[PDB]
Amino acid sequence: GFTDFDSLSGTSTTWVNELGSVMTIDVDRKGGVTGYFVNNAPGTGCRGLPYDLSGHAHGSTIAFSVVWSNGIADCRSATSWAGYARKTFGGGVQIVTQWSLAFVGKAGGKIETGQNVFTYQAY
Amino acid sequence: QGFTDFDSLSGTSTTWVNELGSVMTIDVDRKGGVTGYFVNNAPGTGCRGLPYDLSGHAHGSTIAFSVVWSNGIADCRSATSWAGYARKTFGGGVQIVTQWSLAFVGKAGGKIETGQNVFTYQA
């Protein structure tokens, strides 16, 4: 059924990345993305709490952002993802993303990049 | 006191310009939700000179935001996400030191490019 992100308009979906961190997103009729990110990555801060997520999806690309502060736990960090839709020959749907990370540690501000692959959960 | 944190910007629109001459004007909600617009000026790029919606999240000294390059006027079939930290400047100014990813989908499907931008606050 999935053609591109225009297929998510009006839907509520859960996605998991390769370290078992979970994004639950509502995509509105115009491709506006709202929802929650839960960090489960071992040896990271701010685990197991929902963090507000916001972004936008259009055609075959998507981008979304979290700041790691929610009034419960603050990890002095922010993450954003930019990505594209990938159809597996298995049948399923993935978002291939590159994340950008900014944080303030003991040596002040730092920026990092890496990959995350999100797999649609058919709940 | 100059810049203290992003939260304190809630209620005042702020304009920022990066080293490519791209400009964004952002509005911060009470929870640190970020909305506003981005005008791209990057040499060689499409979707230059008109506003694109931006969304994101900010708290303390970190921010993450993204833009999908489609505004009902020109669609570049791409999305950029930034994450950055606040750097205070001699004389009471502030910059956002960012890492970015651009996801674009052409004939070969999706590809990712990355780089750095530094945004300067213009009072």
Commentary on this structure:
2 copies of one chain form a homodimer. By secondary structure, chain A is an all-beta fold. The first copy, chain A, has one domain. Chain A is built from no helices and 8 strands. In chain A, strand 7 and strand 8 form a beta hairpin. The interface between A and B is large, with 47 and 47 residues. The PDB classes it as unknown function. The entry lists the keywords biotin, unknown function.
What's the arrangement of secondary structure elements?
Two copies of one chain form a homodimer.
Chain A lengths: L10 E6 L5 E6 L4 E7 L11 E9 L2 E9 L4 E14 L5 E13 L2 E13 L3
Antiparallel strand pairs in A: 1-2, 1-8, 2-3, 3-4, 4-5, 5-6, 6-7, 7-8
Give the strand tally of chain A: 8
Order of helices and strands of chain A: EEEEEEEE
Instruction: Specify the oligomeric state.
Output: homodimer
The number of domains of chain A is 1
Greatest contact pair?
A-B, 47 and 47 residues
- Shape designation of chain A: globular
Structural class of chain A: mainly beta
Strand content of chain A: over 45%
Q: So how many helices of chain A? A: 0
Q: Tell me about the biggest sheet of chain A?
A: 8 strands, antiparallel, barrel
Backbone CA Rg of chain A: 15 Å
Major sheet strand order of chain A: 1-2-3-4-5-6-7-8
Provide the helix percentage of chain A: under 10%
Distance between the termini of chain A: 15 Å
